[PDB]
Design a protein around this ligand. Structure first.
Ligand SMILES: [NH3+]C1CCCCC1
Ligand SMILES: [NH3+]C1CCCCC1
Ligand SMILES: [NH3+]C1CCCCC1
Ligand SMILES: [NH3+]C1CCCCC1
Lengths: 419, 419, 419, 419
């Protein structure tokens, strides 16, 4: 069990290059199953689900090779069943279902099991595919879908906003007969990217980024070159590291319009921010952040994946700040860990009242959420002494080697394998 | 009791000139109590609360005269108590409190009474003034505020978004000593207008229209000329009248950027919309609206004051539409009335599942909410036969003589006084 | 000399606010000399002649101030001579003669000399005043009209239709004792607007717009507020600019009924025109106009002042169309310039035979007529490359900053101060 | 002849992407003739000489394709003559000589005649190849170099510092047997980049950038991917454009270390400069530069190619500053042009004494030098009015569409195709 030994305090300053978003890379890699011609998917992070995804794709008959880009040849896909040993590892594997049924008329995906029933993560994908004309077959542990001929464009009203389901329905709708209209569609930048990649291949999609997506089915999708958008959450993470350490950074390969709410909150914290078409710089000019009031909300509001990071900022800011979590219940496990690092906070329900302290003290901390865990590495950077963040695999799975990026901003961090 | 006798169906087409918003006019008229020099407030609707407001202002020693504009001379305000006989009529009279205390150090407003306690409408104004340094005195029926010297700029965190309170705090903060920062500020266009009017007089305010307003207190406010923004809800109302009748209209003196969500919903309904800097045209080209899915949300999302009007549109649209009300519980009283006019709908909780019918049938209908009541006049315009909308005073109080505007679009409507 | 440097091709689209007609504004300003009470002349363009007229009016003892309106107080006129220095710049200064004699019993206007004698410009004005009872005194350099008492109504048959003489006679007649009949009165919209202003101050005038104007003299004229009608020729110019560049335009503050013939011709050219009471929209829908046949004749037929502009529309349209000047000679001097931009046309007698070309090429062009000079700017905007229109001062004096209005529609234009 | 018509004043601000240095790209393209395997030359500007060189290379049997990179396959060179038709257009074609003889044993370059004899351009190249063992054959119209076997390393003392001869000698030496020493080698960044490309294909070169380059001949050179360094002079030009217009700019794809002297001078002028590894930001903060003293000298001192630009910065700066050319004569021919734009300067010997003026006035100007001609465009942008820079073809050949880059920074500029 790799852990991170962080020694502070260190001011974080320098340049960081942002990785492509895994949450844009994944749905686009699955959507590539619709492409008859070879595809080059650029700016793909090297992360565990990317590797599980290429292995899965390979199991279906896809020719996949990698390195900066992921090159895909899906012209000869011929195994329409995503097996449990390749899918047990990753929930995103549900995204192979839509493309297989839309293009080949059949698909099946093994499912991870449970005692809890009702509004399980895959349920909206099943019903979105069913809405589009697919015949669904379920038995515990798998979902099988098939369609007689082509899927048929449908007017789908999502009762709940789902990124997962929005991608499944949108992507399957590109080869459906006619027009599909998705109401109450997820607006996440990863949704827009997946829609643009699909358009790049020949799909007819509009409203991506808005609450209503319109898809005009076409006969087949071609191939092409497509660059995955920058990871907006990793960008925010780095921007908070320089903001909580009196730092100055430049985030390269960034996409500023995916972070309006985050940047606005940083500017309220006292940050001096400038942005380019592909970059964001932040300078605290050596000042302590000023506390902020944050309310997480669906994109494009302040993102819940930036909440633990902003908790940490209030916790070392000047003043009293409140973080209100409206998306997720229970996403405050970083709090007790930070209280152990010397923070002053009160959790009242789905909020934390933060009372900024000048300095934190190093500790043996652990969080299972990757944003909370990464916030712990960050506090460790500015805390006095040594901080040991355990169960670092949660960060490694969503951040392309954060210690190398952090070490490059002046952090004293080291990976400690075993013990 | 004036009622409206409406005979249809009539296609609604032509031009309508939008009135200034009463909800922008009211807070600006109260904010004019801060102006040492004469002020010309243009584009003020001629409505009951405008008349109660001028009478109140006059009682405080304000010189007020009217006609298109409302000219105010508040240099000699010298009676700082808003009496019950002038305020019992209007809740907005709470807005005299902030300006009187900020400018004169004392103010008192009579209050309408009740058995229900906790989060009463005036409570956030009292605590916002208290936050700014005012000493509050309460006894059932009145609120008295005074301050020793000047109010003092404060960092206020609103736990609930309040247009009312945002205006009170913002307006009082213009003469406070220092900077006031309002977190979770209401963003309504009426908030931006009131902020711009204040700026017009010499105030230092920024972030109006955003969730964080910053006010840098100044010593005194001057005078000037200011035009109240168009009424965005009356504009929406007219746009729905042409959209539900196969109509074509041009809304003059409009402000298109205050209605992005409304226009987007109309375009989803099949409307052909073009807008100018001050105008909006809509053409259904004789087609029936297509049903839409609507979710009311805080500005700038779809407004709850447009919900009854869009209920009516789904109810005569082609297809099944759902209206979800998230702002107000219980704002579906127009539904049973429309069901009586031949509509097909199901209310499930805070939603209505609408099944569009080609034509409605005239009826004796009544609604107490002015948007619901106005929606009833509109259905009456397109319904078969005669519709009698009773208790029309609810419309008259918020719409400058809608029958004249409607009659001008081809409606067969008549005011019937008594019986 | 100032020149306009234009870069095309550009599609002209957007909104344009039509300015008040200068030829309605000049006769109305001079007529204000009759007003005993202050008058506000709204919608007056800012053009050289307006400036000369305010200057001329001030010299008579009139108090005048400007900006969107021109405010006049002619209550203290004490000087009754319009001197050579002010009048040598403007032919319209003759218009001071009738109101001075009618109201004050005497007027004197300096005239520029010439060796030509015989049906000279002003002889209808001189003789029309003389038929109204004025005594006329002439010396080569000027004309003086005077009367003891009041002028007296007369039945006047004009041998030539003259807008200038119609205005002088009609304005003077408003204060004459009795009834004046003007047979063969000018029927132009600017005549009608002058009569309407006069009637607004209390005159009794009927038949304006007809071949016979009947005036019932009143003892005095008041004051008030009067808005100058929209410039119909500027309106057609902008409508032609959209029509020839595949554009879409909304002409605001327009008066559709003073342009019926132009609008009908534009619809014949393929234009999708919509009109309101104070606006006109034209949409080409990205298409090229279709050649049209035009015969210019006296108002309300197709106006000769729109001929240059429609000659340019036919030269870039689809097809062959001929333009005939039914009254005026030597009006196609801009056609050789346009042929130098790649146009195809034969000029035969009073007609220009046009053979539309798809695209023009920039050239160095010059027209001495205001309208033909404005047509050459319009041509620069659609031509390939750069057009340099020389001697632009005619356009500056007849169009209120046409470069700013064109620019707002998409034109790339520059004023070149050197030659 | 093409001219640039510029309209000022304009503040130049924004981002600009620096193009690859043409003078690094030319010597690298010719050096690719030595590569046995295909090579991708990235970051090559699209300029005339690049086009001439690809054309010249194709004639030798090289397979070349372009766009952001230049792809070369010199595996089949079968023709070893660079003919008059291709070379008469470009002096840099001499660079084909060394690689042809080194790799293929023979090369021939046509030379344009001249009646002047004696330390002619190419005599260092001819004699440098001859010291490497080549046999040189000369006839007035051309030079042919050939060798039986391999060239052989030699200790070469250059009597004159020459970038051209340094490139020919160093490139040829990479395939020679043994060690070549070049004493008094050119030290420019473009020399260093050429040596670095050579080393990238497998050469053994050290001391590039120093007064002595040591080469260890290898038997063959491979292939690969090599990116041309950023144009340092274009970088300084854009940095000067921000600095003289109160601007703010980010130079992207820059290499700060090839401009130390220019950056230090800019900081002396009042500029707020920040640098990264591939970017440079400069902010004037809306202020006017302060006059600076400049002495141009050999790299890495202040570059003579930045003199014209800094002469314009001093002429619009606050104060007096003198610019001295320490090596080159007759380099201030653009100063009379700038004095014609209202500048104050005395040209005394090899120095220009500058007295800053607050604003320039447009004029019709022309400079024959590329850099002085680019300085005159920059001057047009800040001057009042219109500047017409004639004979712009020098700038087109040395700067990759400077008008598009200027325009993106705010410049109003036009190419005028006629004279
Ligand atoms: N100002 C006028 C806009 C064109 C439509 C009607 C209003
Ligand atoms: N196309 C239109 C623009 C002007 C208002 C009415 C319709
Ligand atoms: N492209 C470069 C932007 C200036 C800052 C660092 C990235
Ligand atoms: N002023 C800045 C722009 C370039 C990136 C870093 C700071």
């Amino acid at each position: 069990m790799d852990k991170f030994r962080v020694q502070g305090p260190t001011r974080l300053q320098g340049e960081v290059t942002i990785s492509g978003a895994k949450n844009a890379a994944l749905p686009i890699l699955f959507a590539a199953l619709l492409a008859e011609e070879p595809v080059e998917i650029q700016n793909v992070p090297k992360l565990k689900d990317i590797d599980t995804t290429m292995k899965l794709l390979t199991q279906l008959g896809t020719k996949v090779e990698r390195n900066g880009s992921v090159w895909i040849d899906a012209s000869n896909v011929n195994n329409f069943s995503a097996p449990y040993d390749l899918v047990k590892t990753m929930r995103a594997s549900i995204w192979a279902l839509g493309p297989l049924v839309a293009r080949f008329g059949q698909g099946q995906v093994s499912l991870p099991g449970g005692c809890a029933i009702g509004a399980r993560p895959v349920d909206l994908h099943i019903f979105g595919l069913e809405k589009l004309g697919a015949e669904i077959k379920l038995e515990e542990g798998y979902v099988k879908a098939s369609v007689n001929g082509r899927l048929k464009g449908a007017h789908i009203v999502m009762d709940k906003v789902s990124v997962g389901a929005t991608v499944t329905i949108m992507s399957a709708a590109t080869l459906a007969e006619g027009t599909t209209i998705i109401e109450n569609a997820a607006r996440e930048p990863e949704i827009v990217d997946t829609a643009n990649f699909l358009v790049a291949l020949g799909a007819k999609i509009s409203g991506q980024g808005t609450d209503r997506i319109t898809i005009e089915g076409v006969e087949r999708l071609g191939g092409g070159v497509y660059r995955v958008l920058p990871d907006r959450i990793e960008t925010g993470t780095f921007l908070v590291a320089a903001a909580i350490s009196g730092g100055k950074i430049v985030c390269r390969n960034a996409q500023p319009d995916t972070l309006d709410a985050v940047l606005a909150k940083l500017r309220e914290a006292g940050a001096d921010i400038e942005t380019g078409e592909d970059w964001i710089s932040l300078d605290m000019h050596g000042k302590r952040p000023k506390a902020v009031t944050v309310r997480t909300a669906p994109h494009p509001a302040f993102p819940t994946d930036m909440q633990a990071q902003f908790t940490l900022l209030n916790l070392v800011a000047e003043g009293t700040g409140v973080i209100t979590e409206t998306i997720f219940e229970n996403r405050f496990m970083h709090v007790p860990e930070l209280i152990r690092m010397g923070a002053h906070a009160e959790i009242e329900s789905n909020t934390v009242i933060c009372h900024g302290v000048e300095k934190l003290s190093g500790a043996q901390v652990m969080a299972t959420d990757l944003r909370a865990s990464a916030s712990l590495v960050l506090a460790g950077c500015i805390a006095e002494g040594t901080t040991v963040v355990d169960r670092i695999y949660h960060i490694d799975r969503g951040y392309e080697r954060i210690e190398d990026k952090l070490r490059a901003l002046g952090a004293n961090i080291e990976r400690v394998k075993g013990e």
